[PDB]
Amino acid sequence: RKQISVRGLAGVENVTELKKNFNRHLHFTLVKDRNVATPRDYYFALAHTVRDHLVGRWIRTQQHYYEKDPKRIYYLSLEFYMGRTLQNTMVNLALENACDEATYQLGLDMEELEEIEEDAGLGNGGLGRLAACFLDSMATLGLAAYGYGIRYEFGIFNQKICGGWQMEEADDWLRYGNPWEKARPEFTLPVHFYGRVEHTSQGAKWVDTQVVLAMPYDTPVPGYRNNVVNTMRLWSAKAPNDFNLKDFNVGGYIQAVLDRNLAENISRVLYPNDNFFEGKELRLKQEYFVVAATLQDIIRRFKSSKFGCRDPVRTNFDAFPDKVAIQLNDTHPSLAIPELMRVLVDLERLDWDKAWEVTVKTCAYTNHTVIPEALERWPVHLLETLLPRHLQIIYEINQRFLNRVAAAFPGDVDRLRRMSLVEEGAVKRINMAHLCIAGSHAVNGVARIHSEILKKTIFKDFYELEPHKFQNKTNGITPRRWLVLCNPGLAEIIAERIGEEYISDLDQLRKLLSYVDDEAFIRDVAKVKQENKLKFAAYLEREYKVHINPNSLFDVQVKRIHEYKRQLLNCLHVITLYNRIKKEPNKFVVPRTVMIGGKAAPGYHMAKMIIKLITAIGDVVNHDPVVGDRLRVIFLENYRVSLAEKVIPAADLSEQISTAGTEASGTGNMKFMLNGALTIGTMDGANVEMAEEAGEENFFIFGMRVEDVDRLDQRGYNAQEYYDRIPELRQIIEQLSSGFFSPKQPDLFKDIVNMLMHHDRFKVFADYEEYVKCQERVSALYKNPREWTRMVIRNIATSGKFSSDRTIAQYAREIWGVEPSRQRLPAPDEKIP
Amino acid sequence: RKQISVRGLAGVENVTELKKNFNRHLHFTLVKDRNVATPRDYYFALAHTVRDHLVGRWIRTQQHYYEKDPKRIYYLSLEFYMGRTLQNTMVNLALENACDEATYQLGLDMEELEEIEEDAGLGNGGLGRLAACFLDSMATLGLAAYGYGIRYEFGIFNQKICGGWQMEEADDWLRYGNPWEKARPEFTLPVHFYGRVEHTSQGAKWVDTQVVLAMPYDTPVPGYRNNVVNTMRLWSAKAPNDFNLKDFNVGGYIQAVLDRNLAENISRVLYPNDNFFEGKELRLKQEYFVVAATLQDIIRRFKSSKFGCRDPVRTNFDAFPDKVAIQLNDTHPSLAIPELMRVLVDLERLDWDKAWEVTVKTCAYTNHTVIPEALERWPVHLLETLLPRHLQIIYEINQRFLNRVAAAFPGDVDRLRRMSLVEEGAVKRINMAHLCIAGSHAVNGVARIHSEILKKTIFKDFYELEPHKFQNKTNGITPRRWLVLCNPGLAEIIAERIGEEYISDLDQLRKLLSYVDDEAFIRDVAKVKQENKLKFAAYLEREYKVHINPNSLFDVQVKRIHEYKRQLLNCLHVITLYNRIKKEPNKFVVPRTVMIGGKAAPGYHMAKMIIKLITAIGDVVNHDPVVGDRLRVIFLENYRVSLAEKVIPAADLSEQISTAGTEASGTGNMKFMLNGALTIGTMDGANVEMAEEAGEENFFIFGMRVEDVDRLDQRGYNAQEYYDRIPELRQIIEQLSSGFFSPKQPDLFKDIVNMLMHHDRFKVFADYEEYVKCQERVSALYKNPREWTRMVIRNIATSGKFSSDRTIAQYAREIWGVEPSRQRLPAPDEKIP
Ligand SMILES: OC[C@H]1O[C@H](O[C@H]2[C@H](O)[C@@H](O)[C@@H](O[C@H]3[C@H](O)[C@@H](O)[C@@H](O[C@H]4[C@H](O)[C@@H](O)[C@@H](O[C@H]5[C@H](O)[C@@H](O)[C@@H](O)O[C@@H]5CO)O[C@@H]4CO)O[C@@H]3CO)O[C@@H]2CO)[C@H](O)[C@@H](O)[C@@H]1O
Ligand SMILES: OC[C@H]1O[C@H](O[C@H]2[C@H](O)[C@@H](O)[C@@H](O[C@H]3[C@H](O)[C@@H](O)[C@@H](O[C@H]4[C@H](O)[C@@H](O)[C@@H](O[C@H]5[C@H](O)[C@@H](O)[C@@H](O)O[C@@H]5CO)O[C@@H]4CO)O[C@@H]3CO)O[C@@H]2CO)[C@H](O)[C@@H](O)[C@@H]1O
Ligand SMILES: O=P(O)(O)C[C@H]1O[C@H](CO)[C@@H](O)[C@H](O)[C@H]1O
Ligand SMILES: O=P(O)(O)C[C@H]1O[C@H](CO)[C@@H](O)[C@H](O)[C@H]1O
Ligand SMILES: O=P(O)(O)C[C@H]1O[C@H](CO)[C@@H](O)[C@H](O)[C@H]1O
Ligand SMILES: O=P(O)(O)C[C@H]1O[C@H](CO)[C@@H](O)[C@H](O)[C@H]1O
Ligand SMILES: *Cc1c(COP(=O)(O)O)cnc(C)c1O
Ligand SMILES: *Cc1c(COP(=O)(O)O)cnc(C)c1O
User: Fold this and answer.
1) A212, A603, A660, B58: which could join B229 in a potential S-S bond, CB 3.0 to 4.6 Å?
2) CA pseudo-torsion sign B488, B494, B499, B505
3) Contact between chains at B186 and A31 (C-beta distance less than 8 A)
4) 3-state class (DSSP) for residue A25
């Protein structure tokens, strides 16, 4: 509808420079002319002109580190959920407004072109987005940091609801190209698979291995206005030419060539599994592949440092921990630990015990869940086929480890079977979380309760052996994408009162508590959210047709569709709302639009069932005339980062409803809090630190605390109890059991009814009384709008702790041992020296 | 050693412009800086700066044709053997010398960088190079022409001789990228496979087909200094997202994604088969794929023309032949004919008989061989599975065709089984050469005897039915790559006397007969060849080590290794030479370096055997001390276009030794003739028109003419006869039979001995007397150097007829019906209008 904002300066020479370079790429890069270039061609010419302002800084940031050669942070993750890159790169370079003017005086709209860009969907959700937000934060804090992972040809599937069912389809995100990567095939590396271990004369050798090659592609990761542009290096698999062809004595020349895309399948697709574990060979291959190739790039750079010169010399890998820190995001790169031992002992010839001190001091591990089906416990027969030397290194690590445990708790023979990284049984397995605690020097959780639950439950044995290892580092979100970029209007009205230094110092938002009684600030804050609601209802009417009321409470739960996350409890609540105004049709109720969105992993039947329940409910509700427009249920299709930048600004209520003690942190919860939604949520994850930051009076907590959850388990949860005692709940179950919500096929929802009644791992009935109660308290407040905005102003004003710049400044200081910085690196300028 | 030449002007502003743009791409495109950029990075910055001078012209050449909208020539070929593109694009734009100065004053050597570029090996040999030379000629003659084919990820394999055996390896030519193509994914197209034909109400429909998508990549094809830049559009296969994923009810989400590279295998690899026929499903798929997608691009452009406006209107496909000419290179795109009928009848609803007149008038076919194992005769069961509607269209074409034949030769029932496009028998098959003659309006051969042999033997029946169809268009070579570019020194000394207009008017070389007695020209012509010999002996010493004598006759046969080409006869000759100076060690013989190079198709055992024989001979010869350096045998490894640009300038004698009546034309023979080698060859292929052009006295013809070959077949060839009567031949066979040439495994060569003796399809013994005789006559002349250079000056001076510009000016006029032109299109200059 309009905007100027402080998306930086649109100054005379630079708007001019821009338009020229735009027209240059459309011709020379695109080989398209004005009369034939479509909005996608206009998108790539600007994408190409914005990455031109980035290579100068990138090249100088990387030669800079060679010259100073800091300790280098390697963030190994198998997921990186980046979303789109043009506007984020414009924000961090301060080009937002010069390219908006430039595009204006060239007759295009930036926002049309910005919507053309495909999201890079290299992640499933929150572990992968945490990685993407960390990368922004490490560059904004001047850290010599490199994010490393796999370049998946197909990222997370694109979800389509057909007949209300999720239909998954392939994310061919590279179809039109990627202007942001730079393929580097000169730097390809081998990764060995299979083979045998010969034991001779001096050491072991892994022999007769198969060779896949690792082709790196680098993406720049620009800091917020400080001229640092760090790197995301993502490996692609390529078959070699000699073995992947020559091994002879008949078998088809064409067949040997077509069989190459079988080694290259290692990076074809991301595994789409939310908090579950799949013991598939292709996954362990992907896990070894990014470990092997990355550790070679690590050592290469450590062998230059300045030791490839001197500092001492006579290859002292002693200094390896003072030059390298490798962060394992979840156990997916836990083979970084046996592999660092392999290259150091086998290839580099250090003694076991030196190379162990060097491995534990450079590695650290971030635990992401306590739900036991998520734990990777790879069967031993898999590892002996695929990685026979690494298995060997794991057995010797385990041997030596349990010798520590038995020394320290002598005689405690059941502790020994519990702490072992080898899980005995029918299928002998390797417990990778155990590997990670044995070979890292810092193990951390993602939120204070999740960190305490690790010390007290899941890893109490390891905590008693080595209390010094366990840490907590509560998650964060980046203020640049999650505020500046999806909510420019909220950021400009904050910018107006307190300035802009808060975008890399979010704790400053607390100076906003002075304006909680300002009537100009209250009205502005509230107009921004009504505007946001209004542009999203438009988006919905446009891209997905639907039409909703902008004057309702926009109640939204968006995250992956898992039972512990409790889209079902939320569901039960909206079926109640419906039933209550059907009983009393002519009662005023605060009108609300409830929007649930998220993806199910392919073969998770319950999750596919819940998406069918939600769309089945909106089939009844959205078509009942007595309901009018007072209640609408919208399933939000193909949830991902660009849609989260659209929804979370338009939200009034944020559903963070998991059973206490299951969500380790959550980060969706933090994003909604700096964007002026109010939380309704259990004392779970970081919801506890958020309520603690704003004050419990300003948050809408309900439900069972974790102590009450264990008490109910001690007792035994009996869901028939809640059904019997609560008539509104009984009525809802029967409606489900009789086909009220599935007419032409009445027994349709009997899997979900049977579960809630008899197999509810997450206790949905136990929290239903206190949940519809709490929900009556947000509607009470909604219709006292000035007092909702003042509660909102106290949530927004207390979001500081949930910046990823604070989380990274604490890993930096207490795990990696580097000091952050914000001194901007010298200006982009020219010089080829 | 030095050069200035007339590689155009190196003028002040433009050398300056160049260096700046070089440094621009190395930074912004390459993201490499001077201190870290290798010679490959320097190659891509110049490749990128030379294609910058080409997009202006390309875009304006293509909008130009839209505006004037000529008849458009579509050259459909499954092979296109382009070799490398930088220097060829510099020649045609006149940038050779500005970029040589530019690179000089930047401290690099062009020739180092020019050697970095990978050859685009999208062809096997001569059919594919003919296509590549035609494209140059069509752009140099201002024709609205488009070359269409498949973009193979792997081209022709790279050959490596290990233990003297060919080892084939994959040509991953795209590893480092291609700076010359422009991917156009917005223009992807579907190609249907499998399915069924429903017959209902109005017409047939091909239903339940599988869908592969065709992703086009365009390469510019610049004319010689006339600002036309035409297009090579090459299709790539891409799996769709919906069917290649959704078809459900359990079967693995990861499996559905990994199974996509199975539709994309259609463009993975070129079939490496020289004049043979493989009836494999993947080949017919590749053949339908480039036909389907191309015919859609043809019709699209015919539906704009100006009829998508008017000219008449009420969709008159009548004018289709006056707007389109599609040339089928060999029978590999013969499905262009049933497919043009399918879209016109089934989709476009014309009557059969209108659409047949429109198909025969737009299609034309070039026959490339008479050797019967080369003929594609696709089994009927293959086509009914894969293309069931097309099979149907072929049966109805055949029905209607034989009704013409039987009307015109009433009662001649064996003619009817001979002319049928359906070859009855155990495996019923479709004769594709027959398809092509029924549905083209011009059928042509590639040289005057090959054209006569078609009218008299292989296609006499079709010639009697339709004499008007049969034509001849003798092959050509492009004077720009095959003279200007690999022989700048020979081109500058010609340029000195007669000027340079000969590079697009090669017939002008005849004004060189005036200098056949010029002693300055004789000495220059001879110094150029000694220089060339000297740089190739260096190349050999460098890249392949070998060391040879530059003062010998460089005797070279380079082409594919097939029995009809007769690398064995040449072999028998060098074993004789060896034996003769072993008999008489101290006889002066003219010293010669014999170089045989070329690739065998993978499973062609005889061809793999002949490469082993040749390297086995050089094992004896190159190590015999009594031989001294008087004779050396060099097998020329990994023969291809860039090596042919190195060898053919350095050649003194050119071996064009096939059994008369088998090589249809040959083009290697023409390249050697404009580069000052003298031919020894049978009266075969275009060797007959070449001898005829220079005078038989100036050529070294020997051997059986084709009449003598049929006489010997009438009689029955008995190779024991030649063995018995010729002692030098008897001695050679015994040396082979006893392991003289294969010591540690004596029976090694008994496949080749057994064949020559009992199964010689190509009569190698029949031509051996006259061949070692003719070979004594070139050595006689070699050691009268001034009289060799004067014979050479009469071959070079009479090469005009063998330009591809003459061949294309005759297809243009007598088959496609367009007039060539040489008026340069307006200067590249600016304007976005
Ligand atoms: O060359 C060095 C070394 O080699 C040899 O030892 C190696 C073993 O031969 C090899 O099999 C491998 O051993 C693994 C073992 O395979 C694996 O099962 C695992 O065993 C653990 C259990 O996982 C753990 O639960 C616990 O089990 C006990 C438990 O205390 C007890 O309470 C009861 O419940 O059952 C079990 C029986 O006591 O402990 C065991 C180990 O005690 O871990 C092993 C080590 O990873 O690797 C060995 C090291 O390379 C030679 O035998 C040895 O002498 C040489 O020093
Ligand atoms: O709906 C239109 C049309 O449909 C029906 O005809 C179709 C046929 O049913 C269908 O099978 C197909 O016919 C093909 C035939 O399958 C194929 O074998 C081929 O036959 C040729 C031989 O290839 C050729 O050698 C020659 O063979 C004769 C030969 O003259 C003779 O000397 C002796 O040696 O042997 C053979 C027996 O006489 O000629 C035959 C054809 O005479 O070609 C056929 C046509 O392509 O396609 C038909 C057309 O769609 C109905 O039968 C018909 O009435 C309708 O008009
Ligand atoms: O992986 P490396 O070698 O440390 C970093 C690579 O990218 C940097 C930024 O483009 C270049 O300065 C460097 O020369 C290049 O090799
Ligand atoms: O599987 P999810 O929820 O997308 C992501 C998981 O990792 C995130 C980042 O550590 C946590 O905040 C979240 O609680 C945890 O369940
Ligand atoms: O295949 P088409 O559409 O005929 C030719 C294509 O390339 C030409 C040269 O870049 C462009 O002018 C044209 O707009 C484009 O669509
Ligand atoms: O298989 P080859 O020899 O490489 C190529 C084939 O097509 C060429 C181009 O029409 C002919 O000149 C040649 O005689 C013929 O055998
Ligand atoms: C931040 C984010 C998540 C995380 O959601 P939680 O509520 O923490 O589970 C998942 N998906 C996307 C698209 C995100 O933006
Ligand atoms: C021209 C050429 C050919 C053709 O050789 P012929 O002697 O006609 O069989 C084959 N390969 C390459 C590399 C060529 O340059």
Assistant:
1) B58
2) negative
3) no
4) helix
